[PDB]
């Protein structure tokens, strides 16, 4: 079978460059007529096509984002790459890669499952260096109990969803 | 300039056994010399989108016969009949007539019984939970990593 897998940094501070990698198996991007697109779904919005690269290194870009995007490939490692410069909160999204094979129609026949990237909101580097170690350590250790309570709400919300099903079984 | 795809409804609550219909209207024709470059995809939580329909009405291999596509020019529809548990999913249209490629904004198909269907529904809950927790984890890593990086620099 044909598999595509997106990988990324997970989180990224604003103004940094996003480097995404699509690792694929089951075919060669050097085969005549193969190509791979990058696509994204921003938070609370619909899917958006970014760029496509063909077996012969021909590259096509979304004109609205062209000046920020760079698509590329390394067929010796079965990898397709995307670079997005100067990210902000509008680049928080799940990023997908998808294959298209030459045909009389034009469609993606196989997709990856996607990778989620969150562009971070607020954390000034110079501001945080000015913090003392105790202040930094206190804030860090305090972040754990809060995350756990947020996760537990999710777990309880989904345990109550399983109960009606588990009873009928 | 860009072909805009207007997909409706955003959300579809249906009863098991009924007909579901999803609509896509394009801002200009997606026809191209005897073929219509309109696709429909299905997406389950945590899974790769799956092609259902291409060239408006052609069914992809491995797609249940309950799915059909129709339409011409600018108006397209996906029809699911009868709706079954396995059809609870996100659906979206996609045009290939012009660059940039564009997508409909999506239809979330939800329901308003066999043990196989009930286990499928039970299993389907886990990737949705995992997705919600991962959003929480990434939100907090956004706050933790600047702090950890400040300590390491010191």
């Amino acid at each position: 079978q044909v598999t595509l897998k997106e990988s990324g940094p997970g989180i990224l501070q604003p103004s940094q460059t996003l480097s995404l990698t699509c690792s694929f198996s089951g075919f060669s991007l050097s085969t005549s007529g193969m190509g791979v697109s990058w696509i994204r779904q921003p938070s609370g919005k619909g899917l958006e096509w970014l760029a496509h690269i063909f077996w012969d290194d021909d590259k096509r870009y979304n004109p609205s984002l062209k000046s920020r995007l760079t698509i590329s490939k390394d067929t010796s490692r079965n990898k397709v790459f995307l670079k997005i410069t100067s990210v902000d909160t509008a680049d928080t999204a799940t990023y997908y890669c998808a294959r298209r094979v030459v045909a009389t129609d034009w469609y993606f026949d196989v997709w990856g499952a996607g990778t989620t990237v969150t562009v971070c909101s607020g954390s000034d580097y110079e501001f945080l260096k000015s913090w003392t170690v105790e202040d930094l350590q206190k804030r860090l250790l305090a972040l754990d109990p809060m995350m756990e309570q947020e996760i537990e709400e999710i777990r309880q919300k989904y345990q109550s969803k399983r109960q009606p099903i588990l009873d009928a079984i | 300039r860009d072909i805009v795809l207007t997909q409706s409804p955003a959300s579809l609550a249906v009863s098991l056994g009924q007909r579901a219909t999803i609509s896509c209207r394009a801002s200009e024709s997606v026809e191209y010399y005897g073929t219509t470059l309109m696709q429909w995809y299905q997406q389950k939580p945590g899974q790769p989108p799956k092609l259902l329909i291409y060239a408006a009405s052609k069914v992809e291999s491995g797609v249940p016969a309950r799915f059909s596509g129709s339409g011409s020019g600018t108006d397209f529809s996906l029809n699911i009949h009868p709706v079954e548990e396995d059809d609870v999913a996100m659906y979206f249209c996609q045009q290939s007539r012009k660059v940039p490629l564009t997508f409909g904004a999506g239809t979330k198909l939800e329901l308003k019984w066999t043990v196989e269907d009930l286990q499928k529904r039970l299993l389907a809950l886990d990737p949705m939970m995992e997705q919600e927790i991962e959003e929480i984890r990434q939100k907090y890593q956004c706050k933790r990593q600047p702090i950890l990086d400040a300590i390491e620099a010191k």
């Binding site: 007529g33 096509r60 030459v102 045909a103 034009w106 | 191209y32 470059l37 290939s96 007539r97």
Partner: peptide
Amino acid sequence: MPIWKFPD
């Protein structure tokens, strides 16, 4: 007629 790149 195959479409090798994008519809043209």
